Amino acid sequence: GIENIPATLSHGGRFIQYNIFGNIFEVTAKYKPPIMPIIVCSAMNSETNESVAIKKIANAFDNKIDAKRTLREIKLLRHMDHENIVAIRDIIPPPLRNAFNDVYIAYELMDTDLHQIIRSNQALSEEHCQYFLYQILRGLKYIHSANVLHRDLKPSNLLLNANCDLKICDFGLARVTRWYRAPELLLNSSDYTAAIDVWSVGCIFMELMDRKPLFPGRDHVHQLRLLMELIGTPSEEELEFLNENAKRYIRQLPPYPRQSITDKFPTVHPLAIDLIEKMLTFDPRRRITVLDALAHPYLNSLHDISDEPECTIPFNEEQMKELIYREALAFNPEY
């Protein structure tokens, strides 16, 4: 094998099988070697000349919820067109239809993610952190205006470029890390809103500032404890809406004073602090809206309301496989 990663033509030379250590990666021949594994691999489409991240999802038809998780990510990402939301560049058809088991999705290529930035301990300009935050909120606005909640934002779900451009990925869960989950979500009360995403952003930004998770809970209850040890105990009843089952739980808890986030994180910019405090609030209804967060002074330099679009139209069980197949066919007319 010439190519470092072993590559071998398959099915009439219309597909290529790349080895990648015993677990083989089979894609359309338009993606010629080399490919770089980053299971996800970096590849170039020789026709469009564009480069992409190809993700292999193995045995997505085996389970119903895996299948629906997949189908949605596809339909959802295919619905969105936004600079801060990751785009699907290709969906790869199966070499033969009956054996369709593994499903490959090609997204646009990003260099890294916010998790890797944070973990790498590289310093960042204030303007960069600012830009990250702005882009997250900006994409989020669109998502929500499409009547969707991400519901799982974390640093690893935020893809980046050397250009510092940021795109959101890994959708699902909207109309196991608890660290970015909103209070209302730890207490069930299944009714919940866009504010849960806002919470996650606040948690992220602080992590970006302090370089460690803001609420690193070991379990469900430790999470809440750590939440309360910061934001303080909520107004007796006025900051409650939810099921009495959890109300009793919160009342039970010892009083927690609010901690000044400025004093705990003195290094960070005060405007940022202000915004975070508004983003981290026990009550969803007192939690700052995406819109107001974009309009917040900290983001004034980037804030342009005309450049912050909404979704023109909003969004929306085995042979869903056929659906995925149909879209793969949409991306690849030759097959």
Author numbering: 32 to 69, 76 to 212, 225 to 365, 375 to 393
Copy the relevant paper text.
Mitogen-activated protein kinase (MAPK) cascades, which are composed of MAPK kinase kinase, MAPK kinase and MAPK (called MAPKKK, MAPKK, and MAPK), are highly conserved signalling modules in eukaryotic organisms. Arabidopsis MPK3 and MPK6 were shown to be activated by multiple MKKs, including MKK2, MKK3, MKK4, MKK5, MKK7, and MKK9, and are involved in the regulation of biotic and abiotic stress responses and growth and development processes16171819202122232425. Activated MPK6 phosphorylates a variety of substrates, including enzymes, transcription factors, and cellular structural proteins21262728293031.
Here, we present the crystal structure of the unphosphorylated Arabidopsis MPK6 at 3.0 Å resolution. The present model of MPK6 includes amino acid residues 29 to 395. The MPK6 crystals contain two protein chains in the asymmetric unit. Amino acid residues 70–75 (part of the glycine-rich loop), 213–214 (part of the phosphorylation lip), and 366–374 (part of the L16 loop) in chain A and amino acid residues 215–224 (phosphorylation lip) and 285–287 (part of the MAPK insert) in chain B were not resolved in the electron density maps. The N-lobe (residues 32–147 and 360–394) contains eight β-strands (β1 to β5, β0L0, β1L0, and β2L0) and two α-helices (αC and αL16), whereas the C-lobe (residues 149–359) consists of six α-helices (αD to αI) and three short β-strands (β6-β8). The structure reveals that although MPK6 is topologically similar to the non-plant MAPKs, the structures of the glycine-rich loop, MAPK insert, and L16 loop in MPK6 are saliently different from those of MAPKs. Compared to ERK2 and p38, the structure of the MPK6 L16 loop does not fit in the groove, due to hindrance from the side chains of Phe364, Phe366, and Phe368 in L16.
